[PDB]
């Protein structure tokens, strides 16, 4: 509800070291290198619930 | 390589900064002041010349209220920079510098002329320091607060453009803190035994008389130079003691802190109490300053109120979205926490308030240099360069045509 156009983050896991990554979004960087930026939010310390408790 | 080997320079109220473009931190820094031994003449710059004792130094600050004072000193300091640190021919390298909110067009033209003709710089640019810092925070419309060593000023910005009206040249700064330390020494009566005149600092306890040895080889210095190195000592002491009460000050509340065992160059080391918190509370309101009924200054919350009110209504929410810190004296502890408390109190909840989260020394001071490097890095900015060919064509008068 805060309305930040660019601060739209989402959950996901990784391919090889699969696990709850936390609210994260991809972003381009210098030298045309994409980088994953993992956020830090109200549930930062509890990023493992699963099944939508 | 959409970045050329450009160099960004940052000079603040307290010290002088600079470094390559796009880098994390300015490469170097050194004291804003320079020690003068009248006889070209003997210039003392950087610690090895300035703080290390010599004979007859008259240290001079070529700055004043963010103004150019000793053009020869600026040229000499630039040459000192180049040789002693960079060792390069910037004539081969574009450069740029920040500017004050109020730098005279005459002096800006003077420096532009000097740069292009003498320093043979290939390109130049200028912009206000607060704008650089606001860039550093990735912000377009906000309020900048800087407790540089000289002033404690507030200047809002909008769309990357300063509000000319918002300038506040408050006096209070690390100079004021040095005055507070001096009145503290007076009320508790400790002299200033500078380190340089102490061969050995012999063992001594709290309250113990200053026990020390002098090195006979010490040619006498001037009161200017000696007093200023003593001021450096005082600022070190402040840092060792920096703190502010987070609420309405109380003498005994502040005294409740365990008196910190701070040592002095002589080797003496007493313990300091509530004074370090009695002092700063005046920064948040000069009226309450016991003994000194400072009223001309605006208390921290008073500064906030003044700056907010003097703006217009529509953007004030935008400015409240950002609040920024800067300056050598911004080292103070309890700085931002008590700042925000005083806000929440005096600042109405009517408008949403939001600050800028940055407290490391690196950010807290060199955010401006960071913003400058940030701008230099951008690939689009290159159209905004200032080619030396254009300056050759139109004199230094091209600044007015190209810089409003």
């Amino acid at each position: 509800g805060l309305g930040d156009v660019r601060y739209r983050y989402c959950l996901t896991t990784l391919t090889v070291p699969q696990r709850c990554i936390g609210f994260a979004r991809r972003r381009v960087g210098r030298g045309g290198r994409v980088l994953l930026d993992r956020a830090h939010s109200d549930y930062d310390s509890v990023f493992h619930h699963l099944d939508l408790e | 390589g959409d970045e050329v080997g450009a160099l960004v320079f940052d000079i603040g109220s307290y010290t002088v900064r600079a470094g390559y473009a796009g880098e994390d931190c300015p490469k170097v820094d050194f004291p804003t002041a320079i020690g003068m031994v009248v006889e070209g003449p003997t210039y003392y710059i950087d610690t090895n010349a300035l703080r290390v004792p010599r004979e007859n130094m008259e240290a001079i600050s070529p700055l004043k209220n963010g103004m150019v004072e000793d053009w020869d000193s600026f040229q000499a300091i630039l040459d000192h920079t180049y040789k002693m640190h960079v060792k390069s021919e910037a004539s081969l390298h574009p450069v740029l510098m920040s500017e004050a909110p109020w730098n005279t067009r005459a002096k800006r033209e003077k420096l532009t002329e000097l740069m292009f003709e003498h320093y043979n710089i290939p390109a130049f640019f200028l912009c206000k320091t607060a704008v650089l810092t606001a860039f550093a925070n990735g912000r377009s419309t906000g309020l900048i607060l800087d407790s540089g060593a000289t002033h404690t000023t507030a200047i809002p910005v909008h769309d990357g453009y300063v509000l000319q009206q918002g300038i506040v040249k408050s006096p209070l700064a690390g100079d004021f803190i040095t005055m507070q330390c001096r009145e503290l020494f007076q009320e508790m009566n400790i002299e200033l035994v500078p380190p340089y005149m102490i061969a050995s600092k012999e063992a001594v306890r709290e309250g113990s008389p200053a026990n020390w040895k002098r090195k006979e080889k010490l040619p006498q210095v001037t009161r200017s130079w000696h007093n200023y190195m003593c001021n450096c000592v005082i600022q070190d002491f402040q840092a060792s003691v920096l703190q502010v009460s987070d609420s309405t000050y109380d003498e005994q509340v502040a005294a409740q802190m365990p008196t910190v065992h701070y040592e002095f160059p002589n080797g003496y080391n007493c313990d300091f109490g509530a004074e370090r918190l009695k002092i700063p509370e005046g920064l948040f309101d000069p009226s309450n300053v016991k003994g000194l009924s400072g009223n001309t200054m605006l208390g921290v919350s008073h500064v906030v109120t003044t700056s907010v009110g003097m703006c217009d209504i529509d953007i004030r929410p935008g400015l409240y979205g950002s609040v920024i810190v800067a300056g050598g004296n911004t080292l103070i502890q309890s700085f931002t926490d008590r700042l925000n408390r005083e806000l929440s109190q005096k600042t109405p909840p009517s408008m949403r308030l939001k600050l800028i989260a940055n407290n490391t020394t690196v950010e807290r001071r060199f955010s401006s240099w960071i913003g400058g490097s940030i701008l230099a890095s951008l690939g689009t900015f290159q159209q905004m360069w200032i080619s030396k060919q254009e300056y050759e064509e139109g004199g230094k008068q091209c600044v007015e045509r190209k810089c409003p």
Binding site: R27 | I313, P348, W385
Partner: protein
């Protein structure tokens, strides 16, 4: 709250694929920017072969657009009544340079030398001038002024009074 970066190495497992693939060279070549009319010669770390390509990044030359008058518009079509030709010219110049940020224009418009005029005064004057030019060559100052004075009144509304106003509103 950090950010992993792309990794290509991982492990010493890539002996081959390089001897067949030359590293295309890079050179600190000069260049010129079209966006700089004087065409200042600067440098790029281009990959050698990418030499002479037009400056790819200077295609953003989009700017503000403001009209102009010479001798009659200021007296025939855009015939002024309150401003000087100098005042109209200065307004339009500040607009062109500032790209229509009317608050910026006003705060950087000479109120003393030119006629002292609020930001909305300049806004309405420009509205008249530009609309006259458009229609002859083919925007609500009053209501907005009323709304803005209302806004500032409400803003100045003393915080306790605002508190009881909101308490009523929620109490509904």
């Amino acid at each position: 709250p950090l950010l992993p970066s792309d990794t290509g190495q991982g492990y010493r497992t890539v002996k081959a694929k390089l001897g067949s693939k030359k590293v295309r060279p890079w050179k600190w070549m000069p260049f010129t920017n079209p966006a700089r009319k004087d065409g200042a010669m600067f440098f790029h770390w281009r990959r050698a072969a990418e030499e002479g390509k037009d400056y790819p990044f200077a295609r953003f030359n989009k700017t503000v657009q403001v009209p102009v008058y010479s001798e009659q518009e200021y007296q025939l079509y855009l015939h002024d009544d309150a401003w000087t030709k100098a005042e109209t010219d200065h307004l339009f110049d500040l607009s062109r340079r500032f790209d229509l940020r009317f608050v910026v224009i006003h705060d950087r418009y000479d109120h003393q030398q030119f006629k002292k005029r609020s930001v909305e005064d300049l806004k309405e004057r420009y509205y008249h001038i530009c609309a006259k030019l458009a229609n002859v060559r083919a925007f609500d100052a009053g209501h907005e002024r009323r709304r803005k004075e209302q806004l500032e009144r409400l803003y100045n509304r003393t915080p306790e009074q605002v508190a009881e106003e909101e308490y009523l509103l929620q109490e509904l």
